[PDB]
Amino acid sequence: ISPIFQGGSYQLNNKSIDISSLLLDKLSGESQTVVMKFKADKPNSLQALFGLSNSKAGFKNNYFSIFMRDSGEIGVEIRDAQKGINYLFSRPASLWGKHKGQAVENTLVFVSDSKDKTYTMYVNGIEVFSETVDTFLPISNINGIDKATLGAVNREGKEHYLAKGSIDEISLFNKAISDQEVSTIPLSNPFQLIFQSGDSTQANYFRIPTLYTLSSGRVLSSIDARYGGTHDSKSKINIATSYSDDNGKTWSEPIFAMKFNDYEEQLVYWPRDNKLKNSQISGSASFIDSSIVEDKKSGKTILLADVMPAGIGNNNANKADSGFKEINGHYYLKLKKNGDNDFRYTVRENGVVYNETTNKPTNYTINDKYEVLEGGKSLTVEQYSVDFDSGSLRERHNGKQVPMNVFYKDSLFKVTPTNYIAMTTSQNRGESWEQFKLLPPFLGEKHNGTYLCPGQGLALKSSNRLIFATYTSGELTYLISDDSGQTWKKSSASIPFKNATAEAQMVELRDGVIRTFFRTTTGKIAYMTSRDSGETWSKVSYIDGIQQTSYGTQVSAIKYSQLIDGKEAVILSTPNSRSGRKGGQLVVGLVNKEDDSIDWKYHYDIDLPSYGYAYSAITELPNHHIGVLFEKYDSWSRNELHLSNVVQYIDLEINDLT
Template identity: 50%
Template sequence: MSKVKKRIIMSLLSTSVVAIYCISDPIIVKGQEVEYTDAIESTNVSENANFITINNEVENNNTNQSMSLENHLDKTVQEDNNNLDSTEKEYTPDYKIENVELEGEGLDITDELEPKIKAGSHTFIVKYSSNTPNNLQALVGISNNNTGKSDNYFDIFQRTNGELGSEIRESESKTNHLISRPAAVWGKNQKNEPVTNKIAFVSNVDTQTYSIYSNGTKIAESTVDKFKPINNISGINKYMLGGVDREGNTAFNFYGKIDLFEIYNQALPEEYLKEKTQITAPGKLIYKAGDSTGSNYFRIPVLYTFSNGRVFSAVDARYGGTHDFLNKINIATSYSDDLGETWSEPKLTMAFNDFANVPLDWPRDPKGRDLQISGGATYIDAAVVENPQNKEVIMMADVMPAGVSFRDALRNDSGFKDIQGKHYLKLKKEGDSDYNYTVREDGIIYDDRTNQKTEYKLEKDYTITKNGEYLEVEQYSVLFENNSKKEFHNGEMVNMSVFYKDALFKVAPTNYIGYVKSKDFGETWSELVLLPPLMGITRNSPYLGPGRGIVTKNNRLIFSSYTGKEVVYLYSDDNGQNWSSNVVSVPNGWSAETQMVELAPNVIQSYMRTNNGKIAFMTSTDNGNTWGEPKFLDFINNPKYGTQLSVINYSKKIDGKNVILLSTPNHTNGRRNGQIWIGLIDPKNNTVDWKYHKDVDYKDYGFSYSSLTELPNGDIGLFYEKFDSWARNELHMKNVTPYMSFTLKELIGKE
């Protein structure tokens, strides 16, 4: 939106037709943005949704109506210029200081700042880099430094794990407000240099709210009882950068550089602060809160480089927070044709419509964070492979009917029936007590009691038609009122899927695996195909190991999956037309999310998550038909519950040897300390020498699920969860799945 209002000339042509003349400037009309070109635009406003409908405003004579509408638009544009598109409006700080380097001593700015800070609301903006990740460092501190008043202070702090927060404390009133979010800032970049972060803190007396922004994202907000304005803390007499003066001693010492510190005696607008705190970060966000996916939360990253040089990504778009189950989850995809510099607009490639795709701010407080969407049909945990024979891309995912979780899925039911040696998807009709129907050839739904066709058909997208007409159900939405969750029908009718809880026919409440295919490198995709019951008619499907499949030298396609006591290799020897399974027992209780690499022709290694904190690996020397006993990587130590990992082949030799790469956390206190390990293959005995490794960030920074790929130029792409996705206090955080890339020199310290 331009700051200067352009000339708008309007004339009323009839009670429903308006001519608008505007010179290349969008305007806002009743909350809708309308873009006009240099040409004169004329439209019937009752027929064009982009224009305000004014029929109820044009009931009197045309002259009055024309003047009224012109005045209305004049007023609207003027109001918009005043509010501005707050990202364009500039604000003048009441105090500003730049280029302060500190080594733990702090800088007293009391004389300069005290006369300038006023009563009321405040905004603090800090641009800084820390070169020593201490446990707790204060960027700014305002305090009462008298003896016995050590708890009278305000600070903005960061911790060694990337947490950013603020405290507002006063002993007399027993005020102790803490607002913070983990995984809020960057530590170091690909070259091991401290990253410059830019953050903002807002104390808003009008809304009784404290808010924090970091690097373009609003990361936390808290509306509190007994709100305490910063300047109302009793006895304030010290203002510091890089620490808090507590009883004459500098606490929470900061080490690094403060490039910029500003204070405003007002609460600046949200959109302005999101823009103001943007930085050039070491990583990019392919998927962002509130983007075209309609989701605020993302998990389970997937990365793959296609044969045409396109870098492809997929991710879980999660609508009910970051929960696995129960939730509403779709698979979103995006791709880059310029080595990961820019990415296509994300789209929902595997998606259900029983719940609206609307960004929800899921509660993060201990009481509200465990709330879940009760019944969304879900796609989860994608894995991708490209078949080099036909350039066809296959993407698999777990498919969960509404209300079915990992815990609830029937273990003794595949969801299919065996009829004369053929497997058909079985269905239960509303009101029945048994699965009396199956989906036969051409999608026709049969009544198995009579072996006769019904008037119903299952379409290729698993929606139901009756005599050629689509059946519909009313969509659900979710909202929060008075700290409680409400699910309700929203009035939107969508095609009825057999995976929806309100469907006339429903699949069995177990888990399935399905796949889609692309013949144009991820731009368009086929309809979903469910895998048949590869584990047998009386067993549910295994669960996919998210990430990527592999294609062996003899063109076998393999995806990995698991059951909790088995690794299940899903393979095809006919270009993905038919699939078989190879079940390999592992110790009971292993999550066994597995990723594979081919060390040599017919030699495959599988690396997997366990329940003992170790990464296990198994080797096959016959193209995956049989497998050796599990062994462990002795240099990786994670919590017992473990974490998914990524492992890929690398095309270049290092130290004269073929190479594989592995990404994983390596920390016993949570999913932290992300590392990329470089393994050199010994072809004599199919062993790997893990000779080099690269720390992605500081050791206490979060790092959970990840996916690696080799870029066309030989650099390494990494798409990962930059937070501890297991920790309860790190649930439901926005914009924490970055993509970044490393040169070979950055990984191993040499070309």
């Protein structure tokens, strides 16, 4: 249907605009839709875009507003004192501010539906909240409403929540338009989604993006598909992948590179209230932190991720145990049988489960999928599903049987409760992935394994060498293969922090010269250099000119193929901020051929300094554009947990950055 009101080209410069005469007497019925296209690249701390209010003395809490914060949060208030109603619905990190230095036109759709008693907010094609209430309050049913305002709320005759920005278009409808109708509304998005709520992964949440340009020109991406909110394990998380064959313009429906079946893949709205937001799927196995590389020699794509058995995160991860037993230069996966207090088994050659106390083999074997077989027959366990129907999180059997896996809670044989690294490969550039294999321990039998650095591995240009950075307490532990990832060795490089989350990414400055940039606990990004293709590593230095928080954030980095200002160039992606994960930048550095030092010459602001930017992935697209897939929110903040569709993709050109 048609708008009852339509206006545009409104400039909000800290002075409200009264549209009462134009709008108020057009409002009728109990259901309304607001469609508003607006820019705000210099927002005030807290500002209202739109208000309906009782402006009379004594009725300061009788109003409806659509408001935003300079954090990028969007919300509404719906208030009527006489009715005793004070609704406040919102979601952090819902907005864009700037893109390529130009103010972004956000498309906001707010639906107030009296029939379903539900308020729903979409921004830029993304539903950011949908709230059902017992007692519905139609927005124009507020006692004594006498003002319709743009860029403030009129309370007791004064302008509250004064806005800075513009409303290029605003329409109102005396109808609650359908989800279908919403999706036909044209958008002006500066970004794309590769992974998103409702896709093939059926995860409502995603974290830890990666990007990698394959030699055929295909761009591949991997990500944590996170089911139990945005929590790091413990949770259910699979590793999903998608690829683009047209320079990032479009992307394939995701598939899984690594998945477990002990818990159902469920699209779940995770509670965001302070009482329940720390609810955590607690009995599921999971993957976390993926990294990609391509091997010139075989042509295979190789993906690694951390693996966690059921219940297990990095907090309850058995340090002081690798999960393997050393038996004469060889490492065998340890197992514990249902009922025993110790790990009395190992998985020897051909997956034969072997009793260590009597040195007899059992009739149990472990297949290539880490599934348990008895006498060649597939054992099963019953799957779990989760729900908050009772009010709190419940994890319960759902009737479906799935293959018994040693990483599962209900398994007859269980691996050691600690962190492992798995590897899978693709022969068809990400169209399918093999069953993963665990990597062996590198730091000894009684050292719990290292943590994979998410993002990219490094494929050295002039050899067959493959390297994946990993971290542990007191060092970076590079994993090195010269035979297409069939065998790996480690190269240890000491760093001056104990228990840092030293997420590290590498660039090749020139043949055999690797610089690694990594996250620290110092508020500055660090780096070290190898000049022998990763055999040995320099001492640690720090970058000036970029700030991180004390706890730090992952940094992504590439070596750009083309000269810039006549020099070799490296591009870093990172939040630039000592307060939180915001102020995203790409920083372009020019290499000094004399000494391999880097002049950080250009800083490109991804969006506003106050808007969220966390983990990121950068790649040089085959057309020499830059692709960026990143968490567009603060993934540290306890106020921004469990947000949907915040991992977003943008395309940039080098001239945009300079």
